Design a protein around this ligand. Sequence first.
Ligand SMILES: CNC(=O)c1cccc2cc[nH]c12
Length: 171
Amino acid sequence: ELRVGLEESELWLRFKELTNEMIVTKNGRRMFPVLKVNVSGLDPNAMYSFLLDFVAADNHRWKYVNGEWVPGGKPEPQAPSCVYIHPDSPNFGAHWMKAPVSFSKVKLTNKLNGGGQIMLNSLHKYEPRIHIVRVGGPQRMITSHCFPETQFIAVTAYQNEEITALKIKYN
Ligand SMILES: CNC(=O)c1cccc2cc[nH]c12
């Protein structure tokens, strides 16, 4: 089997416990913490592209009320984010397996934007997800992995100061 783990899941779990928030901006704000993925069971000599995207974990708009997050009362079906291609893509099994795969450069925006940046729906909750796409071979293949530990709400500003505190402590 191809095996796909989360690096620094303990760091991530400290945020999940509080309800994680990622800042989103006109031009795009990078993520903290950064999604880092351990990957074994690739073909060292095969070709893979690493895709990242962001599934609306539910169909609700969220709001900060009496110091806690709660869902609105009007679900819209959510489209998944556009895909961000890891820049080491495409690359050999052995590249992706030799060190953790960092998506340190992904930028999250809330605006109708040019390129690079991934536009998210403000105040919706997102599950990060990666697609390992085997390329070059005669048969294209996809393996997808979601990361519950890395769930967050897209915010223009931090609401829970406890999150802000953690973001500065571990940055
Ligand atoms: C119903 N609308 C949407 O699903 C939507 C809106 C704005 C940004 C994103 C990113 C992914 N989906 C989005």
